[PDB]
Amino acid sequence: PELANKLDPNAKEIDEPVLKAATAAKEEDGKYFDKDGHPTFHITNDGKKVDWFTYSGYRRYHAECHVCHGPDGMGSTYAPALKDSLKRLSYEEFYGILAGGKQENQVMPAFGDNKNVMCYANDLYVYLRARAAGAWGRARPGEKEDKPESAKTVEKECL
Numbered sequence: 001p002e003l004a005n006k007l008d009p010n011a012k013e014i015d016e017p018v019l020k021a022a023t024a025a026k027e028e029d030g031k032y033f034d035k036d037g038h039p040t041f042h043i044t045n046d047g048k049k050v051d052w053f054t055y056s057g058y059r060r061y062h063a064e065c066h067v068c069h070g071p072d073g074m075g076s077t078y079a080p081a082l083k084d085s086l087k088r089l090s091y092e093e094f095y096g097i098l099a100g101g102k103q104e105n106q107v108m109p110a111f112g113d114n115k116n117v118m119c120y121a122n123d124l125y126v127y128l129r130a131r132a133a134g135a136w137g138r139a140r141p142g143e144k145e146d147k148p149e150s151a152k153t154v155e156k157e158c159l
């Protein structure tokens with residue numbers, strides 16, 4: 001139905017198993033979920049329009065993560081490429097690394113005490129999930145879906 005994606009027909013780096021596991025099964029007010037109950041994306045009109053959290057997660061990524069992890073999750077001299085990471089990592093593995101950090105030299109900081117990051121954890125997951133599935137390229141999202149009212153009142157409370 002309207003839960004289905006419609007991506008770039010000239011999308012050359014799609015990962016079908018990762019994309020299939022990210023198919024939207026449910027929608028609760030601008031928020032999409034997969035059959036496992038975990039957040040997911042929703043691309044529309046041939047790879048140009050994106051759901052709110054993919055849009056929002058891009059911006060939070062550029063703000064708070066791009067420095068060590070490179071543009072579009074491509075990787076850097078000090079940190080791995082998160083577009084490949086979210087092929088293996090489950091939603092809760094990602095959330096735990098983000099909240100508590102990871103070490104080996106090589107340190108990923110714990111962001112748990114950083115509400116400007118933790119309150120957008122689902123946004124970061126969704127966007128980087130869309131990268132891992134090859135459902136979004138290395139562009140900035142243009143057309144988006146409207147920001148839902150649900151997001152604004154929990155953004156209120158979380159911050």
Ligand code: HEC
Pocket residue numbers: 061064065067068069078079080082085094097098102103104106107108109111117124
């Ligand atoms: C500073 C440099 C940063 C910043 C600001 C962020 N990350 Fe994180 N990250 C970083 C390192 C050195 C590592 C590797 C740690 C190790 O080798 O043990 C990581 C790792 C991750 C992971 C797990 C990667 C994997 O195992 O595949 C995730 C997920 C991750 N980083 C995500 C992430 C996000 C969402 C950030 C947003 C603010 C972020 N990092 C910041 C170094 C750094």
